[PDB]
Amino acid sequence: MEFAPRSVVIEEFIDTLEPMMEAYGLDQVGIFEEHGEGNRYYVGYTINKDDEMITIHMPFVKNERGELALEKQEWTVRKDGREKKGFHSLQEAMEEVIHS
Amino acid sequence: MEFAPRSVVIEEFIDTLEPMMEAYGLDQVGIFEEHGEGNRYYVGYTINKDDEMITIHMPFVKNERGELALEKQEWTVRKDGREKKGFHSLQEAMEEVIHS
């Protein structure tokens, strides 16, 4: 896996933020990060849809220097406190966010 | 406010991780971060209670230097995709997490 500083990864998610909000007509979205067990890491977005918080994220691996590497081309959707996987693109994840 | 580098803030939350897990008999907990709008930033924990993801967090202000400062002594509990605040300590927040 190719590792990059955390800031570089965050910036990539930030660059897609506005385009994603415009495309899906979202009013309030922010960057989401979670530090998992055993140097596992999750990065994505949290959408505030009328007081409901919906989070979508991708899996990363964190090395000794804190750098991050994308683990798999898969998005997970966290809604109502439960997670659903199997989404292979942001568009697919958003389809679940908007239409489920 | 008292600003400190993000790394310093994260490490302080990490220091309380194991003690909190032992005190409440939690099996899987990690650090949670969310970049809000404007100068808003949120830091806390996400607990995996039998597949249910429950997040608790505190409000921070991020200055132009990327540093973080605690904005208010209050915890917010995000369960089932919705948030509830008014908790003034981690103990109070956990009571909402556990006793619910």
Side-chain angles (χ1 to χ4, degrees):
Chain A
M1 302 177 284
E2 293 180 295
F3 287 91
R6 165 181 167 284
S7 63
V8 171
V9 175
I10 298 297
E11 286 300 305
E12 186 161 299
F13 277 83
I14 289 176
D15 293 326
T16 287
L17 185 58
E18 184 51 50
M20 174 183 65
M21 291 175 79
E22 180 180 304
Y24 292 101
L26 307 177
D27 184 60
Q28 177 164 41
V29 183
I31 304 301
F32 162 88
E33 294 182 70
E34 258 180 20
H35 309 207
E37 299 182 302
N39 292 176
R40 283 187 277 293
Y41 212 83
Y42 308 95
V43 186
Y45 304 107
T46 289
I47 298 170
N48 179 319
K49 178 183 63 60
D50 258 60
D51 307 301
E52 193 194 330
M53 309 302 110
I54 304 163
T55 299
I56 57 173
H57 58 78
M58 299 193 86
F60 293 79
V61 167
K62 186 174 62 56
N63 68 19
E64 304 190 307
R65 277 294 174 177
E67 295 182 302
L68 305 176
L70 181 291
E71 176 193 305
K72 180 184 301 181
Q73 178 54 44
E74 175 168 48
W75 284 85
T76 293
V77 175
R78 186 186 297 178
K79 177 181 294 185
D80 302 309
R82 312 294 298 193
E83 303 202 320
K84 294 181 64 177
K85 344 296 182 300
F87 306 103
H88 304 306
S89 69
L90 175 54
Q91 293 196 309
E92 290 172 52
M94 284 306 307
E95 177 174 59
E96 179 70 6
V97 170
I98 299 301
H99 294 288
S100 73
Chain B
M1 300 177 273
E2 49 177 57
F3 284 109
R6 167 179 169 283
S7 63
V8 169
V9 181
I10 294 299
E11 289 307 307
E12 303 183 320
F13 273 86
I14 288 176
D15 294 321
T16 296
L17 189 57
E18 182 54 42
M20 183 186 96
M21 294 177 71
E22 179 181 305
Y24 294 96
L26 310 177
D27 181 57
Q28 188 181 303
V29 181
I31 303 298
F32 162 86
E33 296 180 71
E34 257 181 22
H35 309 205
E37 300 180 304
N39 61 12
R40 302 188 184 67
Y41 205 85
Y42 308 94
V43 186
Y45 303 107
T46 289
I47 300 174
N48 176 315
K49 186 175 64 58
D50 188 59
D51 302 306
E52 179 184 3
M53 314 302 238
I54 302 173
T55 299
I56 55 175
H57 57 76
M58 301 192 86
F60 288 81
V61 175
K62 183 176 183 183
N63 60 29
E64 281 192 289
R65 299 172 184 291
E67 297 182 296
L68 301 179
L70 182 61
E71 181 197 306
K72 182 178 180 179
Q73 178 53 44
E74 172 171 49
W75 286 82
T76 296
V77 177
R78 185 186 297 177
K79 183 180 298 179
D80 302 303
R82 292 182 176 296
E83 305 196 319
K84 295 173 61 178
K85 53 165 52 189
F87 308 102
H88 300 305
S89 70
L90 179 51
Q91 298 58 59
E92 286 174 51
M94 285 306 301
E95 278 300 295
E96 182 61 42
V97 175
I98 302 301
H99 296 59
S100 180

Coordinates of all heavy atoms in Angstrom, one line a residue, chain A residues 13-59:
Chain A
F13 N -10.0 14.5 0.5 CA -11.4 14.5 0.9 C -12.1 15.9 0.9 O -13.2 16.0 0.5 CB -11.6 13.8 2.2 CG -11.6 12.3 2.2 CD1 -10.4 11.6 2.2 CD2 -12.8 11.6 2.1 CE1 -10.4 10.2 2.1 CE2 -12.8 10.2 2.0 CZ -11.6 9.5 2.0
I14 N -11.3 16.9 1.3 CA -11.8 18.2 1.3 C -12.0 18.7 -0.2 O -13.0 19.4 -0.4 CB -10.8 19.2 2.0 CG1 -10.8 18.9 3.5 CG2 -11.1 20.6 1.7 CD1 -9.8 19.7 4.3
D15 N -11.2 18.3 -1.1 CA -11.3 18.7 -2.5 C -12.6 18.2 -3.1 O -13.1 18.8 -4.1 CB -10.1 18.3 -3.3 CG -8.8 19.0 -2.9 OD1 -8.9 20.2 -2.6 OD2 -7.8 18.4 -3.0
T16 N -13.1 17.1 -2.6 CA -14.3 16.5 -3.2 C -15.6 17.0 -2.4 O -16.7 16.9 -2.9 CB -14.3 15.0 -3.1 OG1 -13.3 14.5 -4.1 CG2 -15.6 14.3 -3.4
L17 N -15.4 17.6 -1.3 CA -16.5 18.1 -0.4 C -17.5 19.0 -1.2 O -18.6 18.7 -1.3 CB -15.9 18.9 0.8 CG -16.8 19.4 1.9 CD1 -17.7 18.2 2.4 CD2 -16.0 20.0 3.0
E18 N -17.0 20.2 -1.6 CA -17.9 21.1 -2.3 C -18.5 20.5 -3.6 O -19.7 20.7 -3.8 CB -17.1 22.4 -2.7 CG -18.0 23.5 -3.4 CD -19.2 23.8 -2.6 OE1 -19.1 24.0 -1.3 OE2 -20.3 23.8 -3.2
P19 N -17.8 19.8 -4.4 CA -18.4 19.2 -5.6 C -19.5 18.2 -5.2 O -20.5 18.1 -5.9 CB -17.2 18.4 -6.3 CG -16.0 19.3 -5.9 CD -16.3 19.7 -4.5
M20 N -19.3 17.4 -4.2 CA -20.2 16.4 -3.7 C -21.5 17.1 -3.2 O -22.6 16.7 -3.4 CB -19.6 15.6 -2.6 CG -20.6 14.6 -2.0 SD -19.7 13.6 -0.6 CE -19.3 15.1 0.6
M21 N -21.3 18.2 -2.4 CA -22.4 19.0 -1.9 C -23.3 19.6 -3.0 O -24.5 19.6 -2.9 CB -21.9 20.0 -0.9 CG -21.3 19.5 0.4 SD -20.5 20.9 1.5 CE -22.1 21.5 2.3
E22 N -22.6 20.1 -4.0 CA -23.3 20.7 -5.1 C -24.1 19.7 -5.9 O -25.3 19.9 -6.2 CB -22.4 21.5 -6.0 CG -23.0 22.1 -7.2 CD -22.1 22.8 -8.1 OE1 -21.3 23.7 -7.6 OE2 -22.0 22.5 -9.3
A23 N -23.4 18.6 -6.2 CA -24.1 17.5 -7.0 C -25.3 16.9 -6.3 O -26.3 16.6 -7.0 CB -23.0 16.4 -7.3
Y24 N -25.2 16.7 -5.0 CA -26.3 16.1 -4.2 C -27.2 17.1 -3.5 O -28.1 16.7 -2.8 CB -25.8 15.1 -3.3 CG -25.2 13.9 -4.0 CD1 -23.8 13.8 -4.2 CD2 -26.0 12.9 -4.6 CE1 -23.3 12.7 -4.9 CE2 -25.5 11.9 -5.3 CZ -24.2 11.8 -5.5 OH -23.6 10.7 -6.2
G25 N -26.9 18.4 -3.7 CA -27.7 19.5 -3.0 C -27.7 19.3 -1.5 O -28.8 19.4 -0.9
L26 N -26.6 19.2 -0.9 CA -26.4 19.0 0.5 C -26.0 20.4 1.1 O -25.2 21.1 0.6 CB -25.4 18.0 0.8 CG -25.6 16.6 0.2 CD1 -24.4 15.7 0.5 CD2 -26.9 16.0 0.6
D27 N -26.7 20.7 2.2 CA -26.4 22.0 2.9 C -25.3 21.9 4.0 O -24.7 22.9 4.2 CB -27.7 22.5 3.5 CG -27.6 23.8 4.2 OD1 -27.2 24.8 3.5 OD2 -27.8 24.0 5.4
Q28 N -25.2 20.8 4.6 CA -24.2 20.7 5.7 C -23.4 19.4 5.7 O -24.0 18.4 6.1 CB -24.9 21.0 7.0 CG -24.0 20.9 8.2 CD -24.6 21.5 9.5 OE1 -25.8 21.4 9.7 NE2 -23.8 22.2 10.2
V29 N -22.2 19.4 5.3 CA -21.4 18.2 5.3 C -20.0 18.5 5.8 O -19.5 19.6 5.6 CB -21.2 17.6 3.9 CG1 -20.4 16.3 3.9 CG2 -22.6 17.4 3.2
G30 N -19.3 17.6 6.5 CA -18.0 17.8 7.0 C -17.2 16.6 6.9 O -17.7 15.5 6.6
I31 N -15.9 16.7 7.2 CA -14.9 15.6 7.2 C -15.1 14.8 8.5 O -15.2 15.3 9.6 CB -13.5 16.1 7.0 CG1 -13.3 17.0 5.8 CG2 -12.5 14.9 7.0 CD1 -13.7 16.3 4.5
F32 N -15.0 13.4 8.3 CA -15.2 12.5 9.4 C -13.9 11.6 9.5 O -13.4 11.2 8.5 CB -16.4 11.6 9.1 CG -16.4 10.3 9.9 CD1 -16.9 10.3 11.2 CD2 -15.8 9.1 9.4 CE1 -16.9 9.1 11.9 CE2 -15.8 7.9 10.1 CZ -16.4 7.9 11.4
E33 N -13.4 11.4 10.7 CA -12.2 10.6 10.9 C -12.4 9.8 12.2 O -13.0 10.2 13.2 CB -11.0 11.4 11.2 CG -10.5 12.2 10.0 CD -9.2 13.0 10.3 OE1 -8.2 12.3 10.5 OE2 -9.3 14.2 10.5
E34 N -12.0 8.5 12.1 CA -12.1 7.6 13.3 C -10.8 6.8 13.4 O -10.4 6.3 12.3 CB -13.3 6.8 13.3 CG -14.4 7.3 14.2 CD -15.7 6.4 14.1 OE1 -15.6 5.2 13.7 OE2 -16.8 6.9 14.5
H35 N -10.2 6.7 14.6 CA -9.0 5.9 14.8 C -9.5 4.6 15.3 O -10.0 4.5 16.4 CB -8.1 6.5 15.8 CG -7.8 8.0 15.6 ND1 -6.7 8.6 16.0 CD2 -8.6 9.0 15.0 CE1 -6.7 9.9 15.7 NE2 -7.8 10.1 15.1
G36 N -9.3 3.5 14.5 CA -9.8 2.2 14.9 C -8.8 1.4 15.7 O -7.7 1.9 15.9
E37 N -9.1 0.1 16.0 CA -8.2 -0.7 16.7 C -7.1 -1.2 15.8 O -7.2 -1.2 14.5 CB -9.0 -2.0 17.1 CG -10.1 -1.7 18.1 CD -10.8 -3.0 18.6 OE1 -11.3 -3.7 17.8 OE2 -10.8 -3.2 19.8
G38 N -5.9 -1.5 16.4 CA -4.8 -1.9 15.6 C -4.3 -1.1 14.4 O -4.3 -1.6 13.3
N39 N -4.1 0.2 14.6 CA -3.6 1.1 13.6 C -4.6 1.2 12.3 O -4.1 1.4 11.2 CB -2.2 0.7 13.1 CG -1.2 1.0 14.2 OD1 0.0 0.7 14.0 ND2 -1.6 1.6 15.3
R40 N -5.9 0.9 12.5 CA -6.8 1.0 11.4 C -7.4 2.4 11.5 O -7.4 3.0 12.6 CB -7.9 -0.1 11.6 CG -7.5 -1.5 11.3 CD -8.7 -2.4 11.3 NE -9.0 -2.9 12.6 CZ -8.2 -3.7 13.3 NH1 -7.1 -4.1 12.8 NH2 -8.6 -4.2 14.5
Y41 N -7.8 2.9 10.4 CA -8.2 4.3 10.4 C -9.4 4.5 9.3 O -9.4 3.8 8.3 CB -7.1 5.2 9.9 CG -7.1 6.6 10.5 CD1 -6.6 6.9 11.8 CD2 -7.6 7.7 9.8 CE1 -6.5 8.2 12.3 CE2 -7.5 9.0 10.3 CZ -7.0 9.2 11.6 OH -6.9 10.5 12.1
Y42 N -10.3 5.4 9.6 CA -11.4 5.6 8.7 C -11.6 7.0 8.4 O -11.5 7.9 9.3 CB -12.7 5.0 9.4 CG -12.6 3.6 9.8 CD1 -12.2 3.4 11.2 CD2 -12.7 2.6 9.0 CE1 -12.0 2.1 11.6 CE2 -12.4 1.3 9.4 CZ -12.1 1.0 10.7 OH -11.8 -0.3 11.1
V43 N -11.8 7.4 7.1 CA -11.9 8.7 6.7 C -13.1 8.8 5.7 O -13.3 8.0 4.9 CB -10.7 9.2 5.9 CG1 -10.8 10.7 5.6 CG2 -9.4 9.0 6.8
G44 N -13.9 9.9 5.9 CA -15.0 10.1 5.1 C -15.7 11.4 5.3 O -15.1 12.4 5.6
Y45 N -17.1 11.3 5.3 CA -17.9 12.5 5.4 C -19.1 12.2 6.3 O -19.6 11.1 6.4 CB -18.5 12.9 4.1 CG -17.5 13.2 3.0 CD1 -17.3 12.3 2.0 CD2 -16.7 14.3 3.0 CE1 -16.4 12.5 1.0 CE2 -15.7 14.6 2.0 CZ -15.6 13.7 1.0 OH -14.7 13.9 0.0
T46 N -19.5 13.3 7.0 CA -20.7 13.2 7.8 C -21.6 14.3 7.3 O -21.3 15.4 7.2 CB -20.5 13.4 9.3 OG1 -19.7 12.3 9.9 CG2 -21.8 13.6 10.1
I47 N -22.8 13.8 6.9 CA -23.9 14.7 6.4 C -24.9 14.9 7.4 O -25.4 14.0 8.1 CB -24.5 13.9 5.2 CG1 -23.4 13.7 4.1 CG2 -25.7 14.7 4.6 CD1 -23.9 12.8 3.0
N48 N -25.3 16.2 7.5 CA -26.4 16.6 8.5 C -27.6 16.8 7.6 O -27.7 17.8 6.9 CB -26.0 17.9 9.2 CG -27.1 18.3 10.1 OD1 -28.3 18.2 9.8 ND2 -26.8 18.8 11.3
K49 N -28.5 15.8 7.6 CA -29.7 15.9 6.8 C -30.9 16.1 7.7 O -31.4 15.1 8.2 CB -29.9 14.7 5.9 CG -31.2 14.7 5.1 CD -31.3 13.4 4.3 CE -31.5 12.2 5.3 NZ -32.7 12.3 6.1
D50 N -31.3 17.4 7.9 CA -32.4 17.7 8.8 C -32.3 17.0 10.1 O -33.2 16.3 10.6 CB -33.8 17.2 8.1 CG -34.5 18.4 7.5 OD1 -34.0 19.0 6.6 OD2 -35.7 18.6 7.9
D51 N -31.2 17.4 10.8 CA -30.9 16.9 12.2 C -30.5 15.4 12.2 O -30.2 14.9 13.3 CB -32.2 17.1 13.1 CG -32.6 18.6 13.0 OD1 -31.8 19.4 13.4 OD2 -33.8 18.8 12.7
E52 N -30.5 14.7 11.1 CA -30.0 13.3 11.1 C -28.6 13.3 10.6 O -28.3 13.9 9.6 CB -30.9 12.5 10.1 CG -30.7 11.0 10.3 CD -31.2 10.2 9.2 OE1 -32.2 10.6 8.6 OE2 -30.7 9.1 8.9
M53 N -27.7 12.6 11.4 CA -26.3 12.5 11.0 C -26.1 11.2 10.3 O -26.3 10.1 10.8 CB -25.5 12.6 12.3 CG -25.8 13.7 13.2 SD -25.6 15.5 12.4 CE -27.5 15.9 12.3
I54 N -25.6 11.3 9.1 CA -25.3 10.1 8.3 C -23.8 10.2 7.9 O -23.4 11.2 7.4 CB -26.2 10.1 7.0 CG1 -27.6 10.2 7.4 CG2 -25.9 8.8 6.2 CD1 -28.5 10.5 6.2
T55 N -23.1 9.1 8.2 CA -21.6 9.1 7.9 C -21.3 8.0 6.9 O -21.8 6.9 6.9 CB -20.8 8.9 9.2 OG1 -21.1 9.9 10.1 CG2 -19.3 8.8 8.9
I56 N -20.4 8.4 5.9 CA -19.9 7.4 4.9 C -18.4 7.5 5.0 O -17.8 8.6 5.1 CB -20.4 7.8 3.5 CG1 -20.0 9.2 3.2 CG2 -21.9 7.7 3.5 CD1 -20.2 9.6 1.7
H57 N -17.7 6.3 5.0 CA -16.3 6.3 5.1 C -15.6 5.2 4.4 O -16.2 4.2 4.0 CB -15.9 6.3 6.6 CG -16.5 5.2 7.4 ND1 -15.9 3.9 7.3 CD2 -17.5 5.1 8.2 CE1 -16.6 3.1 8.1 NE2 -17.6 3.8 8.7
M58 N -14.3 5.4 4.2 CA -13.4 4.4 3.6 C -12.4 3.9 4.6 O -12.1 4.6 5.6 CB -12.6 5.0 2.4 CG -13.5 5.5 1.3 SD -12.6 5.9 -0.3 CE -12.6 4.2 -1.1
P59 N -11.8 2.7 4.4 CA -10.8 2.1 5.3 C -9.4 2.4 5.0 O -9.0 2.2 3.8 CB -11.2 0.6 5.3 CG -11.5 0.4 3.8 CD -12.3 1.7 3.4

